[PDB]
Design a protein around this ligand. Structure first.
Ligand SMILES: COCCOc1cc(F)c2c(Nc3ccc(NC(=O)Cn4cc(C(C)C)nn4)cc3)ncnc2c1
Ligand SMILES: [Cl-]
Ligand SMILES: [Cl-]
Length: 297
């Protein structure tokens, strides 16, 4: 962390009346928070309703979780809108609990989308089959969103396919479910000290020294590329997170290329996984690299 989210300002232009929201089904829930599908009336200039996503806390939440939701709102307001990120539509900070209104993404999280599309995947129609072209586009859009986050001095800390949403026209949006994810029952989060952490996506310096940087997010992006080109497989298959796992990461063990990864995409993964953070590429360098790969395709 380079910037203190609590000190970031919230623009009151985002303020929306909560009585103009109609809550539907829960899209995701954790121990202290949830994301609900909702209908927002008067969000559009004309008298028309629109589907939105609303993040809110559960009655189970404490002062820490209340501050974390406000900190998330300040970060979203500070960042402003970007094509490759879930965008803020509004918020409710008066007359009740904090509500954060973000855009609805019709295809949901990228991880479940890849798992659902896995069997009909075509490397190279009405069928809407997942292709290598879509995977390259997804890699490019996420690198672009990450380059923008880096440019605003923001560290994601939990970049993974599960924190990517898919919307209209195979458009990816970096998100953070955070408290609206049941990390206690998610096998992708491991007990490490007093926390439940996504260890298989974390850079060694994050694991062993609690250091989160622009470079540690780059490491996670490399893990994300592995998930993407394996069509939603869990990283380090058959390897539990134990003493042997930590020893192997420290001693230089790295995953082999996934079945559908082009050699140039696996080259990015290897550089993302450099033990030296200074030897890893920046998100901007990754964007330029993928750009070249797409044009040459
Ligand atoms: C087949 O699928 C059917 C549709 O299913 C869904 C499921 C969902 F969970 C959805 C969803 N959830 C959601 C996830 C995260 C957040 N909040 C943030 O990301 C806030 N944020 C953003 C950041 C950084 C800038 C990256 N940090 N915090 C808000 C909402 N949203 C929209 N549409 C969804 C659609
Ligand atoms: Cl509850
Ligand atoms: Cl609250």
């Amino acid at each position: 962390s380079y910037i203190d989210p609590t000190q970031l300002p919230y623009d009151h232009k985002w303020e929306f009346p909560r009585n103009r929201l109609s809550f539907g089904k829960t899209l995701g829930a954790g121990a202290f928070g949830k994301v609900v599908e909702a209908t927002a009336q008067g969000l559009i200039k004309s008298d028309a309703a629109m589907t939105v996503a609303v993040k809110m806390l559960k009655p189970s939440a404490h002062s820490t979780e209340r501050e974390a939701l406000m900190s998330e709102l300040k970060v979203l307001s500070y960042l402003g809108n970007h094509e490759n990120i879930v965008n803020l539509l509004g918020a409710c900070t008066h007359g009740g609990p904090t509500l954060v209104i973000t855009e609805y993404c019709c295809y949901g999280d990228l991880l479940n989308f890849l798992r659902r599309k896995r069997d009909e995947f075509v490397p190279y129609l009405y069928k809407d089959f997942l292709t290598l072209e879509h995977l390259l586009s997804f890699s490019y859009q996420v690198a672009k969103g990450m380059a923008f986050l880096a440019s605003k001095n923001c560290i994601h800390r939990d970049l993974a396919a599960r924190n990517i949403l898919l919307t209209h026209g195979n458009i990816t949006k970096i998100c953070d479910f955070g408290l609206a994810r049941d990390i206690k029952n998610d096998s992708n989060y491991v007990d490490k000290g007093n926390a439940r952490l996504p260890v298989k996506w974390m850079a060694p310096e994050s694991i062993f020294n609690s250091v989160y940087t622009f470079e540690s997010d780059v490491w996670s992006y490399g893990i994300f590329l592995w998930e993407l080109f394996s069509l939603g497989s869990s990283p380090y298959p058959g390897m539990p997170v134990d003493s042997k796992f930590y020893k192997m990461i420290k001693e230089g063990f790295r995953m082999s290329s996934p079945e559908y990864a082009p050699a140039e995409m696996y080259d990015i993964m290897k550089t993302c996984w450099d033990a030296d953070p200074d030897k890893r590429p920046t998100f901007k360098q990754i964007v330029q690299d993928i750009e070249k790969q797409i044009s040459e395709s």
